[PDB]
Amino acid sequence: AEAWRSRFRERVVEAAERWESVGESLATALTHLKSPMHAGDEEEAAAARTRIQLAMGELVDASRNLASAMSLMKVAELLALHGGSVNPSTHLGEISLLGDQYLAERNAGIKLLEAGKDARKAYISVDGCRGNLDAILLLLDHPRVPCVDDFIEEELFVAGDNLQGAIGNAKLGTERAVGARQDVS
């Protein structure tokens, strides 16, 4: 009923920082993916590869900070499940079983559980976007393929769609994590 609650707050505070970093990296990645990419000239292909490598660097940052946010939020939940348990040998089965003396942590925990889902969906969508950008890199090395620029256009569209999905998940996840922070601050 004491120390774990501070640790819980610190983890929620740090999770919200990670989430805000994720949103910034995803947004910057998308700025690189707006205009068309072309393979039919070596200079245009090089321009496109550079844009892709910039986007990829932002997506690695986003993925890392998503992985950190998930870990932090999970540890916070477990702090509460163990900390809130009446018997020192056992942990609570789920956050909604927390006693009403820990209402702040219980309210925060409910948000962290859904933020966890938001983070996992964002992570998956980022990996999808990466997959599309990897496909474009393959297509840029086959300029003689008929219709190669149509295939690039297809993959670029899907990359943006996947990334826009992640952006939406991160918006919600960040909102939940800041809500959780507010619950315990």
Residue numbers in the entry: 3 to 187
Task: Show sentences the authors wrote.
Although PBI1 consists mainly of the DUF1110 domain, the molecular nature of this domain was unknown. Therefore, we determined its tertiary structure of PBI1. The crystal structure was solved at a resolution of 1.84 Å. PBI1 is composed of a four-helix bundle with a diameter of approximately 19 Å and a length of about 70 Å. There are six molecules in the asymmetric unit. The root mean square differences (r.m.s.d.) between each monomer are from 0.15 to 0.85 Å. We observed no large conformational change induced by crystal packing. The four helices of PBI1 are arranged in an up-down-up-down topology, and the bundle is leftward turning. The interfaces between the helices consist of hydrophobic residues, whereas hydrophilic residues are exposed on the surfaces that interact with the aqueous environment. In particular, the CC domain of Rx is very similar in structure to PBI1, with a high Z-score of 4.5.
We identified PBI1 (PUB44-INTERACTING 1), which belongs to a protein family with the DUF1110 domain. PBI1 interacts with WRKY45 and negatively regulates its activity. Therefore, it appears that PBI1 keeps WRKY45 in an inactive state in the absence of pathogen attack, and that PUB44-mediated degradation of PBI1 activates immunity via the de-suppression of WRKY45. PBI1 is degraded upon perception of chitin, and this is suppressed by silencing of PUB44 or expression of XopP, indicating that PBI1 degradation depends on PUB44.
